[PDB]
Design a protein around this nucleic acid. Structure first.
Ligand SMILES: O=C1Nc2ccc(Cl)cc2[C@@](C#CC2CC2)(C(F)(F)F)O1
Ligand SMILES: [Ca+2]
Ligand SMILES: [Ca+2]
Lengths: 544, 404
RNA sequence: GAGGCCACAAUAACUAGUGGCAUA
DNA sequence: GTATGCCACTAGTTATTGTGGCC
């Protein structure tokens, strides 16, 4: 006796009362044949007028989307699935598929009446044969959570007597692993089959059991290693939007074991609204990226399982334009898994910051898969990290990492001054734009009497404040004081960006490395502060 | 023993909060703790037909590194708030904030004896997760009043007054306040005979060091200079102009007048008499108690924190922005560790003064906070928190507070 | 009776709060 | 003139499409 699990409908809802559409004669003859056998085995029972519910007859015999919508929620199982790199190496592995899974769990008695369904009559002159389920139906929302729960109770006694044997439940399958030599493993497998059989659960016998490797969730699981099923990424002379979507899916799937995969350039090609049939021209830096990906995927790879008595090491490399790859291993050149990290894209972020978020993502993934955080090896000097994080408003914390000298390193290209530079020319910068016409001006005025204004087309307030800083840098000497009222423009400069999507900010970073001393100061707009006032009158002339 | 009926507000569903993933060392500690709690009847395993869930963590608590279990009942507490505040609300003693010394004691085990209403137990569901999702997840629910639920002291409150009522006749100038699983004992007695007086209470109930007036708001102090430069004036003007949202009497008009025309930043600027006077009233506004701020009991408290650098943090407690009920400085290891002790300091001080915990605004990325906050947590409550940027002028302003 | 369900990713949309600015 | 947009930081949500699965 497997005990039933009490199941209720959602508050306020009654059961399904859907109409059964007429079917072909060749279809009704098959249904009454399936159903009479299910009645003889006790899985369904003929019902009659006392039952007011119905669900249309349909993998699945019956289509329960209406019932499923009205069924209570379950705090449901197999939220996530194991990742292979978190499994331990085994000597012997078996997979048992439980044949009569749902047919072996009785459905809560007072819930049975909601699973009613009708095989219709041929000419619909007659009413049809009506049934309901006595067991978990295929396709009912509760069957997976209730079967899993039953299987967990059935496996408790066997798990207890056999501590050394690992059993993972996955849908209808048991994955059974052990360090026993194959013969003594098979003795245990058959003991497990007998245990399951007491509750009516049937499994393949030794002759019918599959041999490693096991195909599971797109992986190929060996006793000592794992790989993905082999990626095939096509070769086309014209790429459609749907095709590019397909490639990014394969490439992102591949990036968990193939190191150094990069998708950022094929992703840019999917921006904007575009029909799925539109042939999209590959930009050549996307073509270049698609090329190095075809290279990576020609070599063969595998990952190894996890030895819980070694440390995990995670190593990160910069791949340029906000892209990062990483590798997890415990023994050198024997990866458990790899992955990638990609920035927001539109925004320009400091490289120390991008690296810290790669670490953050990897740390979270690593607690999920192995239950412990890794030791990091990062292309950043311990004092480059220190000067950046002690000068930044935000808190962070990487518990243990160390410098590894694999270029491109991350470094701070420039260092701004804390105090104004004596004898250097003071620039007051400002910009202005009108939203309607998208016209703007940017300029400066100088304590030494100099001034400039430039007019810009298709621009914004934010761009003109950066243009104005662009000009002050362009037209000053190796030492300069600059004064702005844009905390935006100023924050971009202090949070030294990596090379980004904006050519304006890249020019500015370039100008700032070439400088020898630069002090930047913020003043509030519209306060009568000299300098700022003079440049504001200049720049706002054609604009306000 | 008979259970108080409990109920969610009649439009509400139960907690369905996702469990943040745990380390292996804490999953093992939770499994051990929970089999012992189940063996004593406190929790029960539940089936899949229970759809609710509430996160669970493990913290090192009671100064000893024997693991403790912390259930994060924040969502449930919000969903039962009329029950534990309107109907069975503990009152907060305004006198507690004035005692010279206040110690805090864990009254957590007292809830274990009291049963919990049948129809409410499903809402206390939690889930011990498993590494790499390799096993389905061990589900329990409470049979006794849970620590961390705010309705626990609300229900046990009538029993709690009878344990302490004999004590109150003895020492009638001692004040006791209960906030969740904690007892705050207020005394004006010398520190030597404070500990003897707080032990005898501890011994008394088993048979069944804060200094609040040391806390005090420091005033802002401005630069004092023999010579002022264009740059010094510009930095000061930008700060005082921002700070006028806090002190409306602050003025920068006479300081801005000194910055006539396009000056080099290093030029020296003599403070005229009008400037010296404006600066001198500005100082006096800032050295005086801030005024016009008063606590509104129908409003959430908010606590904001700024990373000041070099192991220094500034914080403000308020209800409406710029109307600070309190400000202060927390001093000294890593950012997350320091930030966790600041949050706990600010929360108990907030419990003592108002009987409420503030909603925190933390200057950290959420995912980093969610990875590490239990590494140093010692408290039985968990405040509400959200994650924010820190504008530069905020950091620059509260950096000017005087030190003890 | 026009497929749903899980993880991950990309895209789009709705964004909201803080901040300084930019036009009215 | 409060009302907006402009984007840096912080936090999201509902839809589509794709990869890998399942029913
Ligand atoms: O912990 C291990 N180690 C391991 C190694 C190889 C194989 Cl093929 C299988 C396993 C196993 C599993 C599983 C599910 C992911 C399918 C097993 F349960 F043991 F089978 O889990
Ligand atoms: Ca400006
Ligand atoms: Ca301007």
């Amino acid at each position: 006796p497997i005990e039933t699990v009490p199941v209720k409908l959602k508050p306020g809802m009654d059961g399904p009362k859907v109409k059964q559409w007429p079917l072909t004669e060749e279809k009704i003859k098959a249904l009454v044949e399936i159903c009479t056998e299910m009645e003889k085995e006790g899985k369904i029972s003929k019902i009659g007028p006392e039952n007011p519910y119905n669900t249309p007859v349909f993998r699945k015999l019956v289509d329960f989307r209406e019932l499923n919508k009205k069924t209570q929620d379950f705090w449901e199982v197999q939220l996530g699935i194991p990742h292979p790199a978190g499994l331990k190496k085994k000597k012997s592995v078996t997979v048992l598929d439980v044949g009569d899974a749902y047919f072996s769990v009785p459905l809560d008695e007072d819930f049975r009446k909601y699973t009613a369904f009708t095989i219709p009559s041929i000419n619909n002159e007659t009413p049809g044969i009506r049934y309901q389920y006595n067991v978990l139906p295929q396709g009912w929302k509760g069957s997976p959570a209730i079967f899993q729960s039953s299987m967990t109770k059935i496996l408790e006694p066997f798990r207890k007597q056999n501590p050394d044997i690992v059993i993972y439940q996955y849908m209808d399958d048991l994955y059974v692993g052990s360090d026993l030599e194959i013969g003594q493993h098979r003795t245990k497998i058959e003991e497990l089959r007998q245990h399951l059989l007491r509750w009516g659960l049937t499994t393949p016998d030794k002759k019918h059991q599959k041999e490693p490797p096991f195909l599971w969730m797109g992986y190929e699981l060996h006793p000592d290693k794992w790989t993905v099923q082999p990626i095939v990424l096509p070769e086309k002379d014209s790429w459609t939007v749907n095709d590019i979507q397909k490639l990014v899916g394969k490439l992102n799937w591949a990036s968990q074991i193939y190191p150094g995969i990069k998708v950022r350039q094929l992703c840019k090609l999917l921006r904007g609204t575009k029909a799925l049939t539109e042939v999209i021209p590959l930009t050549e830096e996307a073509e270049l990226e698609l090329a190095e990906n075809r290279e990576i995927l020609k070599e063969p790879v595998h990952g190894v399982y996890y030895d819980p008595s070694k440390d995990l090491i995670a190593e990160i490399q910069k791949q340029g334009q906000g892209q990062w790859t990483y590798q997890i291993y415990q023994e050198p050149f024997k990866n458990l898994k790899t992955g990638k990290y990609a920035r927001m894209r539109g925004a320009h972020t400091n490289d120390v910051k991008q690296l810290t978020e790669a670490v953050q993502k990897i740390t979270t993934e690593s607690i999920v898969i192995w239950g412990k955080t890794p030791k990091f090896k990062l292309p950043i000097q311990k004092e480059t990290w220190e000067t950046w994080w002690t000068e930044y408003w935000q808190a962070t914390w990487v518990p243990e990492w160390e410098f590894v000298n694999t270029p491109p390193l991350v470094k701070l290209w420039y260092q701004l001054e804390k105090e104004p530079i004596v004898g250097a020319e003071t620039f007051y910068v400002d910009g202005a734009a009108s939203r309607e016409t998208k016209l703007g001006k940017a300029g400066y005025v100088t304590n030494k009497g100099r001034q400039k204004v430039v007019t810009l087309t298709d621009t914004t307030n934010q761009k003109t404040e950066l243009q104005a800083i662009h000009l002050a840098l362009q037209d000053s000497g190796l030492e300069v004081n600059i004064v702005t009222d844009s905390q935006y423009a100023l924050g971009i400069i202090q949070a030294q960006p990596d090379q980004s999507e904006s050519e304006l900010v890249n020019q500015i970073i370039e100008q700032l490395i070439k400088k020898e001393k630069v002090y930047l100061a913020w003043v509030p707009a519209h306060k009568g502060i000299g300098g700022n006032e003079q440049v504001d009158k200049l720049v706002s002339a054609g604009i306000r | 023993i008979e259970t108080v009926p409990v109920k969610l507000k009649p439009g509400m569903d139960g907690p369905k909060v996702k469990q943040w993933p745990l380390t292996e060392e804490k999953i093992k500690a939770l499994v051990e703790i929970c089999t012992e709690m189940e063996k004593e009847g406190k929790i029960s395993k539940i089936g899949p037909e229970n759809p609710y869930n509430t996160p669970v963590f493990a913290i090192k608590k009671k100064d000893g590194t024997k693991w403790r279990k912390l259930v994060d009942f924040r969502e449930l507490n919000k969903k039962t708030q009329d029950f534990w505040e309107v109907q069975l609300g503990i009152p907060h003693p305004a006198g507690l904030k004035k005692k010279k010394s206040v110690t805090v004691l864990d009254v957590g085990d007292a809830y274990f004896s009291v049963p919990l209403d049948e129809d409410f137990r499903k809402y206390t569901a939690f889930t011990i997760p498993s590494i790499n999702n390799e096993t389905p997840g061990i589900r329990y629910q409470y049979n006794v009043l849970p620590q961390g639920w705010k309705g626990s002291p609300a229900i046990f409150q009538s029993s709690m007054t009878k344990i302490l009522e004999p004590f109150r006749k003895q020492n009638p100038d001692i004040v006791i306040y209960q906030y969740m699983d904690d007892l705050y004992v207020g005394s004006d007695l010398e520190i030597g005979q404070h500990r003897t007086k707080i032990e005898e209470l501890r011994q008394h109930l088993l048979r069944w060091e804060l200094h609040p007036d040391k806390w005090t708001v420091q005033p802002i102090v401005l630069p004092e200079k023999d010579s002022w430069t264009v740059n010094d004036i510009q930095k000061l003007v930008g700060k005082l102009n921002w700070a006028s949202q806090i002190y409306p009497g602050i003025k920068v008009r006479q300081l801005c007048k000194l910055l006539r025309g396009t000056k080099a930043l290093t030029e020296v600027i003599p403070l005229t008499e009008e400037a010296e006077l404006e600066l001198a009233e500005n100082r006096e506004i800032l050295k005086e108690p801030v005024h016009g701020v008063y606590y509104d009991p129908s409003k959430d408290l908010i606590a904001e924190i700024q990373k000041q650098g070099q192991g220094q943090w500034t914080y403000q407690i308020y209800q409406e922005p710029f109307k600070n009920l309190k400000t202060g400085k927390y001093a000294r290891t890593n950012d997350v560790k320091q930030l966790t002790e600041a949050v706990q300091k600010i929360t108990t001080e907030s419990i003592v003064i108002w009987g409420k915990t503030p909603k925190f605004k933390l200057p950290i990325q959420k995912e980093t906070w969610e990875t590490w906050w239990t590494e140093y947590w010692q408290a039985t409550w968990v405040p509400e928190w959200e994650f924010v940027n820190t504008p530069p002028l905020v950091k620059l302003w509260y950096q000017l507070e005087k030190e003890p």
